[PDB]
């Protein structure tokens, strides 16, 4: 599973 | 506007060590993490971590987690990147950049002007401005050439502009090459009409940072 | 590491054409509870800092123009360009942001052709070196050769006729933004002492739109 924490700029639920 | 405003190019010596500072503008600096990513020459983007503004919590690539700390300064809203022990193989631009900023309202991407670190013995060395007139030599048809010779500096890059910026059309700025002497050197031409060069006035203006040289040379037939 | 793997290295199509740059991840890169690609496309213009395109594999930036389009899932991706545009001339760079370390591919050169099949030969201009070198007591020659394309040329030097081999530099540009040309720049470099024991200069100049040698030269003084 993805690592949310690889870029913390991403918000894995915003398009 | 979202801004990344880096220091400037640097020689450093095998060995030493070497801190680049990116100050940040336009949003709230502790809002972000800021990334450090490197491109050696010729080479693909290299990441090397990151820094949250806020908290200064920090992750780092296993290449290189042994020699780089990443920092930063909420009140001076900057981060800095600082690589020890330098080696030939760092000689590279260092870039900070907010990477993917996908938030629930926007999305963006932005990017320092990139920082030249070249790791080397050799001392900094500011560059000589020569004209490139232009005569009969350098004009065919109905336009001329002329340029500026950029000449025995180091380390890397100068900037070359033509006018202040205002003569953009038909310059060629071509990649410096390393002479014998391991100092670069570089031309910057343009063409124009052969009618107009009465009246028209041609200045290149040249920056080499690591020196904090600054030439403006008007090149006249 | 994920490692990025782009095909081609490099490619060359029309303006109008259509470009295709793929990428392969050692590793699956979508998440199936959100149905998302970790992936973004990135552009990079020489002496530039990348540009964000693509996102989540296949989500344009605002501001990006619809010519750009990512398609694929998991380990295969895909970024086009419908109808290349001369400015797209750039290095395409994939980057997956699934796990740590972040990762880049190797990076695929985007160069341009000419549709109509046509030639460009190159303009051939000489300077002689400026009084200002000559006082520092060094003598630089540069011949330009503007605009061609295709990119393959040959500059020889010529000294009182004899042809030179071992003491002249050349650099070439990166292809125009605009044209599809090239141009290139070749230094004779000679002390002043050695200047000033010659009278004729040349260089002499072969390219595919050329029947014969294009020769330029001056006496010295």
Known sequence: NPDPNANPNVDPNAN | ?221 | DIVMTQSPDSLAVSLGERATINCKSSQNILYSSNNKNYLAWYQQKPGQAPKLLIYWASTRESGVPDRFSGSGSGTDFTLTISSLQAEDVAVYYCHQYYSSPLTFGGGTKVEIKRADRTVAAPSVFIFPPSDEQLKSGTASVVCLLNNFYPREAKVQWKVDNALQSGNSQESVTEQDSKDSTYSLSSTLTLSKADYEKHKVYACEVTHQGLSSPVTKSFNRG
């Open chain 2, 1 to 221: 506007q979202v801004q990344l405003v880096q220091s400037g190019a640097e020689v450093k010596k095998p060995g030493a060590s070497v801190k680049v500072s990116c100050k940040a503008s336009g949003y709230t600096f502790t809002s972000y993490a800021i990334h450090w990513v490197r491109q050696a020459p010729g080479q693909r983007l290299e990441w090397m971590g990151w820094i949250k503004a806020g908290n200064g919590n920090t992750r780092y690539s296993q290449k290189f987690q042994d020699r780089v700390t990443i920092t930063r300064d909420t009140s001076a809203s900057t981060a800095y990147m600082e690589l020890s022990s330098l080696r030939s193989e760092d000689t590279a631009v260092y870039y900070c950049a907010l990477l993917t900023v996908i938030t629930p309202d926007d999305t963006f991407d932005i990017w320092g002007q990139g920082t030249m670190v070249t790791v080397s013995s050799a001392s900094t060395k500011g560059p000589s401005v020569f004209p490139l007139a232009p005569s009969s030599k350098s004009t065919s048809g109905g336009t001329a050439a002329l340029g500026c010779l950029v000449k025995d500096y180091f380390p890397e890059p100068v900037t070359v502009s033509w006018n202040s910026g205002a003569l953009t059309s038909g310059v060629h700025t071509f990649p410096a090459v390393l002479q014998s002497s391991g100092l670069y050197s570089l031309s910057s031409v343009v063409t124009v009409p052969s009618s107009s060069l009465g009246t028209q006035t041609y200045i290149c203006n040249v920056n080499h940072k690591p020196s904090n040289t600054k030439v403006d040379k008007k090149v006249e037939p």
